[PDB]
Write a protein that binds this ligand. Structure first.
Ligand SMILES: [Mg+2]
Ligand SMILES: [Mg+2]
Ligand SMILES: [Mg+2]
Ligand SMILES: [Mg+2]
Ligand SMILES: [Mg+2]
Ligand SMILES: [Mg+2]
Ligand SMILES: [Mg+2]
Ligand SMILES: [Mg+2]
Ligand SMILES: [Mg+2]
Ligand SMILES: [Mg+2]
Ligand SMILES: [Mg+2]
Ligand SMILES: [Mg+2]
Ligand SMILES: [Mg+2]
Ligand SMILES: [Mg+2]
Ligand SMILES: [Mg+2]
Ligand SMILES: [Mg+2]
Ligand SMILES: [Mg+2]
Ligand SMILES: [Mg+2]
Ligand SMILES: [Mg+2]
Ligand SMILES: [Mg+2]
Ligand SMILES: [Mg+2]
Ligand SMILES: [Mg+2]
Ligand SMILES: [Mg+2]
Ligand SMILES: [Mg+2]
Ligand SMILES: [Mg+2]
Ligand SMILES: [Mg+2]
Ligand SMILES: [Mg+2]
Ligand SMILES: [Mg+2]
Ligand SMILES: [Mg+2]
Ligand SMILES: [Mg+2]
Ligand SMILES: [Mg+2]
Ligand SMILES: [Mg+2]
Ligand SMILES: [Mg+2]
Ligand SMILES: [Mg+2]
Ligand SMILES: [Mg+2]
Ligand SMILES: [Mg+2]
Ligand SMILES: [Mg+2]
Ligand SMILES: [Mg+2]
Ligand SMILES: [Mg+2]
Ligand SMILES: [Mg+2]
Ligand SMILES: [Mg+2]
Ligand SMILES: [Mg+2]
Ligand SMILES: [Mg+2]
Ligand SMILES: [Mg+2]
Ligand SMILES: [Mg+2]
Ligand SMILES: [Mg+2]
Ligand SMILES: [Mg+2]
Ligand SMILES: [Mg+2]
Ligand SMILES: [Mg+2]
Ligand SMILES: [Mg+2]
Ligand SMILES: [Mg+2]
Ligand SMILES: [Mg+2]
Ligand SMILES: [Mg+2]
Ligand SMILES: [Mg+2]
Ligand SMILES: [Mg+2]
Ligand SMILES: [Mg+2]
Ligand SMILES: [Mg+2]
Ligand SMILES: [Mg+2]
Ligand SMILES: [Mg+2]
Ligand SMILES: [Mg+2]
Ligand SMILES: [Mg+2]
Ligand SMILES: [Mg+2]
Ligand SMILES: [Mg+2]
Ligand SMILES: [Mg+2]
Ligand SMILES: [Mg+2]
Lengths: 210, 147
RNA sequence: CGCGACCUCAGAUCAGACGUGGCGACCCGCUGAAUUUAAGCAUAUUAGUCAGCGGAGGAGAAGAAACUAACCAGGAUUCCCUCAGUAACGGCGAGUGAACAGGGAAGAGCCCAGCGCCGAAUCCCCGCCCCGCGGCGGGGCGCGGGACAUGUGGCGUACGGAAGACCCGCUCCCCGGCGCCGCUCGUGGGGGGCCCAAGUCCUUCUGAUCGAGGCCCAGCCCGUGGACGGUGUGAGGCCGGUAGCGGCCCCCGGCGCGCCGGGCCCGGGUCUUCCCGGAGUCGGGUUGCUUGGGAAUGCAGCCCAAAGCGGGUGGUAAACUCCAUCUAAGGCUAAAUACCGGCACGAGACCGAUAGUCAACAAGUACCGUAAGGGAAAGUUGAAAAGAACUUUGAAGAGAGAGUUCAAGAGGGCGUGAAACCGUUAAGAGGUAAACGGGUGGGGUCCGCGCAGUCCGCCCGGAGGAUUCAACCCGGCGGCGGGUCCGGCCGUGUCGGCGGCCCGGCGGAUCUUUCCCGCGCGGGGGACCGUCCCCCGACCGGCGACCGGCCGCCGCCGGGCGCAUUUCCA
RNA sequence: UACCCACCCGACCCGUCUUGAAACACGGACCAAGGAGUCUAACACGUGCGCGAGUCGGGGGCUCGCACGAAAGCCGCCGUGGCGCAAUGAAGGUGAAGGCCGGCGCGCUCGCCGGCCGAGGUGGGAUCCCGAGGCCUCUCCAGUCCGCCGAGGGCGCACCACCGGCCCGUCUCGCCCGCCGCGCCGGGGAGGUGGAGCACGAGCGCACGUGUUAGGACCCGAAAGAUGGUGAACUAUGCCUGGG
RNA sequence: GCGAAAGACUAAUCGAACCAUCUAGUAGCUGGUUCCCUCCGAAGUUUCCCUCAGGAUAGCUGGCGCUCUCGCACACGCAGU
RNA sequence: CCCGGCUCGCUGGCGUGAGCCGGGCGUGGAAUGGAGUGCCUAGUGGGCCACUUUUGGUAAGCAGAACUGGCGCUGCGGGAUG
RNA sequence: CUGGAGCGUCGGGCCCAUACCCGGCCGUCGCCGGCAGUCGAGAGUGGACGGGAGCGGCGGGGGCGGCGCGCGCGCGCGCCCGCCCCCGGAGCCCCGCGGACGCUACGCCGCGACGAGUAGGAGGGCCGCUGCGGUGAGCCUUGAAGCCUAGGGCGCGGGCCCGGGUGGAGCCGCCGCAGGUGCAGAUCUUGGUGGUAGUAGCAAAUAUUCAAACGAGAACUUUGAAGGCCGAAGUGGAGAAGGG
RNA sequence: ACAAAGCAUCGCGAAGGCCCGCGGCGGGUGUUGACGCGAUGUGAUUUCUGCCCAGUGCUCUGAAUGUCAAAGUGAAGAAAU
RNA sequence: CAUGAAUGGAUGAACGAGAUUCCCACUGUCCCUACCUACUAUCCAGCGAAACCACAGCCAAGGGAACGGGCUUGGCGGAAUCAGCGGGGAAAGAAGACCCUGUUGAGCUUGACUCUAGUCUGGCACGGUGAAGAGACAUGUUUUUUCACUGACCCGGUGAGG
RNA sequence: CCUCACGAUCCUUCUGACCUUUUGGGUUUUAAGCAGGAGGUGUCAGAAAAGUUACCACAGGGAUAACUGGCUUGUGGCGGC
RNA sequence: GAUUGUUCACCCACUAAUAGGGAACGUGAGCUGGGUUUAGACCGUCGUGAGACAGGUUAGUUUUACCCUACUGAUGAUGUG
């Protein structure tokens, strides 16, 4: 029975909620179950990035998240035979491998290849055995570190470049940006019909000749 | 708390604030918003005008990210930038007109509300208003489009 | 009319295995209501919920795109925040009601069939020996079987692969044992066993204290221990315990070196030659349930029933048309995730015996019902039974004495022992049922008194008696306030130092890549501004923020003052 | 004052529904203990507090075996995100500024170029500011200090009333357009009208109250409906086998 | 189900058994609804409703305020006149 | 109220009219009293009686209106009782 | 009740409500109320300071008067000249130099007005119940909770404090927080107990009596004797099912 | 009241009549066959059983030019149609 | 009003714990009551309940919710009880079974609304082989009508025996 | 001539704009919008709806009958001028 | 007294007369149960039907006093040494 200017209030309690209510008194104890695992895993793989393998630089899909950059699922295959890392080997040197990424641009390719060239350089490969062969970094840069990287390895920071002040020319001061936008929004609108008149006006030149 | 509740002060009061003529029976009106057409019409029609009935056009599977477009007014443009880049202007004697990337501060559109300081600018955005064009132009400055 | 292969198919108490049932909180298939809501009701809603049924596990299911998207694009699944009570559904009403992106927890990927290549390169069970045997295996040897050509094993599976040619670079892991070395985070992994500080010190209560004062610093001692429980009250010290990278003894777990037995000739990049995908499925028609999915989301039954630059998807049917994006019809998979059952624990602003579970007890018991099922009531003597010997009356139950007890005015359903109600004793009343409100009076039980209650407290005057001072100075101590802001310390506003500025930093889409380091970007320096710190000088708020001197006053102590003073008493 | 008794006056038994209850209306022998407006979510307004065009809070994370801890603290997480900072249209979409002055297009209530001011005006407006004149002061006059009263005059918050103005939708009517294209292209004007709009802001979070709902929902109360089950030991028949 | 038929009988139950659950089913309808003091104080009327034992909206009520006025020798405003 | 002056795309032989700006002037019948305005909001939505007016009815402690007043919501003195 | 205690028309006098008047107390509302250290009762200014001077003054309305006059200006003393001085003291009815006992500043105080109430709202509750964070150098075996009291009192009241008694182990005051928080009632639930009442009742099938025994105790057991009934379609002698 | 003997209609030759069942190529009648089974009505005997096929039923080798769907076929379209 | 033919009409011996009427016989049914018996009740020893109960219990009249026990005014009132008694407590027993309301139900009905099992009919599928022949359209297709067959399928029998 | 002669949501249809959407582009159909009319709710602020119960049930109602009692007294009876 | 469930009615007969009424339309824990007014049945009418009928007809449980009062009897009671 409504009274005098409320809202309409469709609240969803008609079904049966009392039975399937999930209370969260685990919440602070779950914070601790995870914390031990997070620690017990880091102590189990001692020299290794605690955060996990290295993930690639990647852009977010929809136009509202255009300009951000994420940590992706794994480095793509096309990326890898540029840096020269075999696809099955990278899975064993802390490089997430995603065999499912269609690369469409060279911009995001090189930007993402750089992290793999960068990874190599600051990577210390404990050799297979104590007395072991090539590509295992020397004992000098083996004693120097036992450091797990707390936090993500080389965190992807959304970073921008400053554009200094300009001298605006008398060409940028002539652009009617509100005008051309309406133009472009009209050309994408009517391009399809305008070509059907050209297809018809091209038939009238062949229909007039016959 | 239960301590400051009118249910305390209603002890020894027989009807308990609900009147002894018409008692507090369970559900006299209906249950929920029930009877908008019938017998509750005076409410729905005089307080919620336009509740009942269809209107407009269906657009099934709408997604907000398609049509995402925040807005700035020229009222607060020099707020997006650190105010010292404004003080390192109206000065400098060169027509510096620092660049304001409205995209970087999270706005895909610049609308023309409010006064604008007499100062040259370059405003990079996605979609402009017409009056926001004229306010920047007439102050001396450019409107630069970004994809 | 015989014998022999194979294909079908029987029988065995044949050799060896395995399945059923139980539990059921969480989980997975299916089945599936009606109360209810809509103020009626049939659609809807309740609700893919209850019940029914099947099946599991320590988690299950899901899972490596026939995906999302339209972007400069993302990349298995599951969970949390979010999207959002939104797009959509709906007698568009009641009501219902997702996803995508983004952030995060976690993060792991993989196999077949086919097409092919390889002398079936394979697997099973027997029989002898070698090791191993309380999760039955490895090693060898056998014309010992059998499966398999209607197809086992190695490479290989779409991310491409194989095969070749040549380009480059050089080769340890796996398993069965046999040992041995470091006991390996709650700060020695799991479990068990046994162990580790300090008062029963003085006095005093008391039935007994663990209480009250006291005891070389809140008393003595210990304190990495002061949680809790026990103990005849209220205890860190009496007892168990507690703390403690405390000790010791077994067992188990798990990881690390050696020996042995076996398995294994396993790479990486380039050019060419071929090689390819799962059918009664997809898809369409239709009917039924389902979603929110709409000219049909998902699922089905029936009918039709494919293709190979094909097929699906691209959220309004359709044609044409371009683009994008995956690869279905086969399979495996840890982690975050769930747990009102079970084992074992820990805790509480919870209940405290009509509460809290039905159940603090011989409780799912007594008891009811033919049965399905229903289902209670009921905790407390004392500290110790020290639970009443004995004498006596009585057939005996019960008494009277006695005794035990701190208490039997704690006596075996015994702490406390309320009210209703009843018994008797005392007092007062009593023909309009009682009871009641106002007003007094009479009587009582006590209570305050008085064996005058004359209540006190100043000041003063008088008469008695007694000790030392006040007043005054002098010595010392300690304050107060005051100003000269006097001398110094302190901070507010301002100015100067551009002095901290690099011996002050932090912040900033300020500026320079003249720089430096690392790979146009990142990091670091250098320039800039805003802000915060040092030197000194000046003005001013001179501020409870002080210190030293000077002063004025007060007070206390100690001296001096002996009595027309100054106090005490009556 | 409370125990008993006495008297004079008053005086019908409470709860309840009810126009009306002492009622020949119903519940009530008596006494103990139990016993009824709760929690959650969602709004709304009021109020308190923090911060303020921002402000969080969750989930995560970083810090413990918790004793007190399943606390407290901290995190470009602090903004991914919500709410707010902007509306309006069914939608494609657009989107909050005007004034003034000078100059130039014929000032044409039209179009363009340089400068100034910037949220318009009217009426009330708490109200601050300025204040003529007074009012004394022991003398006549002189005169600076201090206030009281203060006619009259000014700025004028908040708010209210009104007139203007701008944004969007729609209409009407009419003009000039710009030209990366060609105008079944886009762009401007004047007048009216629809809007939950702007017209130098007020929100966010956290508490508490009141109210309304959805919840079993202040407590107790149906006749029913549904799903699974257990009964022919009574009785209703049929059958089988015995007895009278 | 069974009925030589009465809606009879089906374990003291029959115009439709008993048991447990869905279930605290729904109720515009009865019944109850627990301490004091202080201040304010109603309605039974309006329109609409498958409305007539109920609601919705009007009123009437309270609470919270705010905007001012000036008994501070120096008041406009309102009114069951 | 009374003057002065501006504005108009309406109205018209001119003027109307309205709108603005600028000045010039105070207690306009009696009696009473501080007024204005915004938020939330409970209960109620069976009513009954009397003077007067009045509709059905023969009449009613009947049915139904008006106007005010009560009773409900409220005791006290009076009407013996109510 | 009858030249009235009757009916008309009239006198005086008297009687009484919670109404009205005066007074007392309690609360509520109002006072732009007073009081955080100050003069001042139709208040109708106060103070520098200079020049000049003095019995001058401000020679204005039967107004009856308000704004100006007769407790002083200047004055006594120091001696025409000086002063006209300081509260660490004027001695105080105004004291502006320092402020109550009073001043828990949500405290205290002075004026007025007013106080019916269901349904309902609001406020205040040193009203009460249980529990937590604080705090009370709280209380307690020299006696806590509870219970009982013709014991002394406080509050308008919710309730509270004391006195005694029994009881045998714990408990409350204040500042905050939290509730399953207050009972007369629901044919309320559970338990207990009355009045009814020593009442209804112990009446279906004809029947008992004497003596003895045993025994504390005999109408009721046992034995003997007598009278009787069931009367073999049994109250007799054996079985089924059921009971155990 | 029911039952009842009796009288009477009615369906049915077994891939049948009536009937059960959730389902089977399942069951009852049926260890049956029209003197049988199933479905009704009246109610011994005696004496009778009259008119009405318009209505509603039931039924009929009955015309189905009335209508009438799924598929099916036909046509237009580019295809849903 | 409003009988009547198997919704059976008319009759009718025997029969009936079936419904009426009359007569004979009989009688305490009655005029009109009386006495007798047994068991009670009654009193006693023993043993001992329950329904019910606001408070309770003498009347007239008045008013009043329009029939009081209580209230107003009168009348009056004397402890504690026993056997009876049925005037009163609108006595107890049962939230009236009648009636009306409810947007509460059930049982049954049908020409209510909406559906359903079942059954009738068509289509499609399993569904084949061979034979003739015909129409319609077209200048092969379709519709197919009819008669055969036996391998699916179906029923029948037996100890699957010619 | 004035005071009555009429109808929401949803749905359907018709009409209007070289309208908008038809969703990865483009062209056509088709569908969805926008703005006006119509198809109708007579219970007319707008449910899609027949009975019976003497076998009955529940919640209630003296708000609503069938007794008594009151008020009234037409009618009935009795009596006057 | 005859008839009638009857109140009411009508007659026979007697008489002095066969007046009229109230007391919850006196009087069911006083009776009876004939009539109404459950469930069984039967007809007529009505209804397609379940069923309806102030239209008839037959069969159909009539509880409790011991309480207070009243009343009837029965003991007593304070007073009168
Ligand atoms: Mg991570
Ligand atoms: Mg009240
Ligand atoms: Mg009530
Ligand atoms: Mg199993
Ligand atoms: Mg409903
Ligand atoms: Mg309802
Ligand atoms: Mg219903
Ligand atoms: Mg439904
Ligand atoms: Mg569902
Ligand atoms: Mg289930
Ligand atoms: Mg799995
Ligand atoms: Mg799987
Ligand atoms: Mg995903
Ligand atoms: Mg939101
Ligand atoms: Mg749903
Ligand atoms: Mg192979
Ligand atoms: Mg020890
Ligand atoms: Mg201890
Ligand atoms: Mg202890
Ligand atoms: Mg499929
Ligand atoms: Mg559905
Ligand atoms: Mg489409
Ligand atoms: Mg797969
Ligand atoms: Mg107990
Ligand atoms: Mg207890
Ligand atoms: Mg219990
Ligand atoms: Mg006990
Ligand atoms: Mg006890
Ligand atoms: Mg004792
Ligand atoms: Mg004791
Ligand atoms: Mg005891
Ligand atoms: Mg006595
Ligand atoms: Mg009434
Ligand atoms: Mg009465
Ligand atoms: Mg009642
Ligand atoms: Mg139903
Ligand atoms: Mg009522
Ligand atoms: Mg009402
Ligand atoms: Mg009052
Ligand atoms: Mg206690
Ligand atoms: Mg004890
Ligand atoms: Mg509690
Ligand atoms: Mg209680
Ligand atoms: Mg005999
Ligand atoms: Mg025997
Ligand atoms: Mg017949
Ligand atoms: Mg005939
Ligand atoms: Mg016919
Ligand atoms: Mg007797
Ligand atoms: Mg009676
Ligand atoms: Mg109704
Ligand atoms: Mg029904
Ligand atoms: Mg029909
Ligand atoms: Mg397409
Ligand atoms: Mg009947
Ligand atoms: Mg019947
Ligand atoms: Mg009535
Ligand atoms: Mg009557
Ligand atoms: Mg009678
Ligand atoms: Mg009687
Ligand atoms: Mg009777
Ligand atoms: Mg009878
Ligand atoms: Mg009958
Ligand atoms: Mg007949
Ligand atoms: Mg008929």
């Amino acid at each position: 029975a409504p009274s005098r200017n409320g809202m309409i209030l469709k609240p969803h309690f008609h079904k049966d909620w009392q039975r399937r209510v999930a209370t969260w008194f685990n919440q602070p104890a779950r914070k601790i179950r995870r914390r031990k695992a997070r620690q017990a895993k880091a102590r189990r793989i001692a020299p290794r990035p605690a955060s996990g393998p290295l993930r690639p630089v990647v852009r977010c899909p929809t136009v509202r998240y255009h300009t951000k950059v994420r940590a992706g699922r794994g480095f793509s295959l096309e990326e890898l035979r540029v840096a020269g890392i075999h696809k099955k080997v990278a899975r064993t040197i802390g490089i997430s491998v995603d065999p499912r990424r269609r690369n469409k641009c060279t911009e995001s390719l090189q930007a993402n290849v750089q992290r793999l060239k960068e990874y190599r350089s600051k990577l210390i490969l404990f050799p297979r055995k104590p007395s072991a062969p090539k590509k295992g970094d020397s004992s000098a840069e083996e004693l120097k570190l036992a450091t797990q990287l707390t936090g993500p390895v080389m965190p992807i920071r959304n970073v921008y470049k400053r554009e200094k002040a300009r001298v605006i020319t008398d060409e940028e001061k002539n652009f009617k940006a509100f005008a051309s936008l309406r133009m472009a929004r009209a050309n994408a609108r009517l391009f399809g019909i305008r070509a059907k008149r050209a297809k018809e006006a091209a038939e009238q030149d062949v229909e007039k000749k016959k | 708390p239960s301590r400051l509740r009118k249910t305390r002060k209603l002890r020894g009061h027989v009807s308990h604030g609900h009147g002894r003529i018409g008692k507090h029976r369970k559900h006299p009106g209906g249950r929920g918003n029930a009877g908008g057409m019938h017998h509750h019409r005076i409410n729905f029609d005089k307080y919620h005008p336009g509740y009942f009935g269809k209107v407009g056009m269906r657009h099934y599977h709408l997604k907000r990210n398609q049509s995402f477009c925040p807005t700035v007014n020229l009222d607060k443009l020099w707020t997006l930038v650190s105010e010292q880049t404004r003080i390192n202007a109206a000065k400098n004697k060169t027509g510096a007109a620092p660049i304001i990337d409205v995209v970087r501060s999270g706005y895909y559109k610049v609308l023309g509300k409010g006064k604008l300081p007499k100062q040259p600018v370059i405003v990079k955005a996605k979609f402009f208003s017409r009056r926001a064009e004229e306010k920047i132009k007439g102050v001396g400055g450019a409107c630069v489009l970004v994809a």
